[PDB]
Nucleic acid binder design. Structure first.
Lengths: 366, 149, 149
DNA sequence: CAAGACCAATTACACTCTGTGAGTGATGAGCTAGTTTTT
RNA sequence: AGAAGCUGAGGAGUCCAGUUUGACUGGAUAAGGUGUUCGCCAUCUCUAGCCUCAGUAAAAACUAG
């Protein structure tokens, strides 16, 4: 995919930045007024107002331009057809497991690397007279001059709709390098966002050695990425990643299994048990799911009790439907790949039956 | 005795898995190139099993550094034959020592071994990986296993 | 044109080196296998130059992990052609940039470049390495030099 | 800290010299919206 | 040698430890049992193991039998 001025005007900036092209006006950058900061723990996120032309132009950039750039198969995140289940699937053939994490990923992505990665797919031509190139015009819709970190240039924010695709595009090179290294070492490699999973089918201590860590760090140092040593995992014959258990007790061509631990399903089991105890929906909504009517934002003056009851019923409906969708997504993944424990299949079938019965009961009570 | 054939990033395959094989499996379709590529993949895999010098297959996309082929063999009947205390032949012991032993044998409790083979079926997975430098890597680093298969 | 051809640990050649090539070279001998192997080595080297997927050559002995093919080209006439001020075409500049530019930036223009402008000859050495895993390595890490040669 | 390994895709001469490579029923109605991972 | 944690602010009762006769500080209810690569891990069984306020942006898979 290659873009020109005509493609940018007629597809990407169809109406948002239409006054700039006609009246010889350079594309403005993203100001602090149109971006708001949301704090969660030690993390910050940048949200762009929908009324801003940059939001529309970056939405169309993601829809028409970033989706056509080729990626690496090891990237199982932020891609059409990608999923966490596909991120964990290739490692059923391995006997040893090693999970690594990069540092703050979107913060360590240099803007120069983004420009270099997106240069081959964008024509090297000037857009607004002999003032600004098309590269800068497109890149001004994806970055943000953050007011923190001593103002060290444009940084890819963690809350834009164009960040993940650009991250995968700029990390395609590192994915290729790491995949080549692991293929030389006979290691299956997969990546989800910034979490890297490595699986060794052979009976070797390569994944438990410091050499693997040093090689991955040296490869990541090319683009400035580091490794979070606080979340280093290196196990054998079994691994647990966020409640997903991959188990393979054997060697010389042994098929592993993927299941979910009881910790992952504990919340839904508690919800079902509470429903079986006829507990009022207020407690379940405010405790198990963490959903409330914040500061009584009812706006309209009307029968508030009925609306509150309807909200505390339909939100529970939505939670049950979402979790049953998650479980049946898992069973569809099993049907597609056949890498899930039969006992876990029976357990999730029972849980699905219980959830269906409970949602039927609560709909009847409605 | 074969249940799964998986091809990833080779010829015209991105990620294609063929399963639930029958006795009289038939192949139809307008995509003759796909059938030819599948035949080429199978022939290349069985040539590399026999340790023959052949030109490596082409990648579907060059933005990936790995081309993979997975073959899963159903080894239930041969396991039942070799694990019987009635045929102590040389070839039977060779098969038992080559494909079987270790893994689920002598690496777990006796109760697991006793209940290991009641009604279940055993599968053997073999992976061929083609790198960018025309190098072939195997999931198991034992030429005897490949020759026996 | 060409000065030396060196074959190490490939086919029937152990440390064989051929030099002092004239306009007409007559190859005689009772060992036809040697002539055939030399022809195979030359053809394999020139096929790898043009990036053709071909089966790698067999090693003389398996107790060696490397097989080398070394070609030395007498790049003296072409260097004089591309160095001359009169010739400033696209192809001449390309030849100068891809062969006679890396070796020129390392030499001082005031003394070394002036001294090298004499009757002395310049040579270009290119080595092809075959590894145990059917992998090909080159002394120069860029296809442009190989393609132009 | 500091680091080898830094993706892939992007036919041919030339001149004066013809041989040489160069010196030359229009603003009361009033409302909402999953799971998981990255984070 | 800088990376990490960490959605934040809190509150009531009770326990432990310390100082201290009188109040403060630190921790802190996903409960119990078993095995563990000892990990925030896995597995099994119940009666399911506190409450209030503030904040919640993005991209992917999933609405099956």
């Amino acid at each position: 995919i290659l873009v020109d001025k005509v493609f940018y005007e007629k597809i990407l900036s169809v109406e948002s930045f239409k006054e700039n092209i006609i009246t010889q006006s350079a594309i403005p950058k993203i100001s602090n007024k149109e971006v708001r900061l949301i704090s969660s723990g030690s993390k910050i996120f940048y949200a762009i107002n929908n009324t801003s032309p940059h939001s529309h132009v970056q939405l169309r950039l993601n829809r028409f331009f970033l989706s056509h750039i080729p990626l690496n198969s090891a990237a199982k995140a932020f891609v059409r057809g990608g999923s966490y289940l596909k991120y964990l699937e290739p490692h059923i053939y391995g006997s040893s497991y090693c999970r690594l994490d990069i540092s703050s990923f979107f913060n360590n992505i240099s803007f120069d690397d983004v420009k270099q990665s997106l240069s081959p797919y964008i024509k090297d031509e000037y857009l607004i007279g002999t003032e600004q190139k098309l590269i800068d015009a497109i890149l001004n819709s994806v970055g943000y001059e953050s007011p923190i970190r001593k103002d060290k240039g444009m940084i890819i924010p963690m809350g834009f709709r164009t960040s993940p695709a650009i991250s995968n595009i700029v990390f395609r090179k590192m994915d290729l390098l790491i995949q080549d290294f692991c293929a030389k070492k006979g290691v299956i490699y997969s990546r989800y966002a910034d979490d890297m999973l490595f699986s060794n089918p052979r009976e070797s201590k390569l994944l438990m050695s410091d050499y693997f860590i040093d090689e991955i760090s040296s490869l990541l140092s090319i683009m400035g990425f580091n490794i979070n040593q606080s979340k280093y995992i290196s196990r054998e014959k079994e691994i647990s990643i966020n409640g997903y258990v991959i188990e393979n007790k054997g060697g010389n061509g042994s098929i592993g299994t993927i299941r979910l631990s009881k910790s992952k399903l504990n919340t839904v089991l508690k919800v079902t048990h509470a429903l079986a105890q006829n507990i009022p929906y207020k407690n379940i909504c405010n405790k198990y799911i963490k959903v409330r009517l914040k500061e009584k934002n009812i706006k309209y003056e009307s029968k508030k009790d009925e609306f509150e009851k309807k909200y505390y019923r339909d939100q529970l409906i939505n939670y049950l439907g979402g979790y049953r969708s998650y479980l049946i997504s898992l069973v569809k993944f099993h049907s597609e790949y056949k890498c899930v424990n039969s006992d876990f299949i029976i357990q999730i079938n029972g849980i699905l039956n219980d959830i269906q019965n409970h949602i039927q009961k609560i709909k009847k009570n409605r | 005795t074969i249940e799964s054939i998986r091809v990833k990033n080779l010829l015209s395959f991105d990620d294609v898995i063929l399963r639930d094989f029958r006795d009289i499996n038939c192949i139809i379709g307008r995509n003759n190139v796909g059938k030819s590529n599948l035949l080429k993949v199978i022939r290349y895999f069985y040539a590399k099993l026999e340790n023959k010098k052949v030109i490596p297959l082409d990648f579907h996309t060059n933005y990936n550094a790995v081309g993979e082929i997975t073959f899963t063999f159903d080894t239930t009947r041969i396991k039942k034959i070799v694990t019987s205390r009635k045929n102590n032949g040389r070839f039977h012991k060779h098969i038992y020592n080559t494909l079987f032993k270790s893994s689920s044998v002598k690496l777990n409790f006796e109760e697991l071994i006793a209940r290991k083979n009641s009604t279940n079926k055993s599968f053997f997975s073999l992976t061929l990986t083609i790198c960018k430098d025309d190098s072939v890597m195997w999931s198991v680093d034992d030429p005897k296993v490949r020759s026996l298969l």
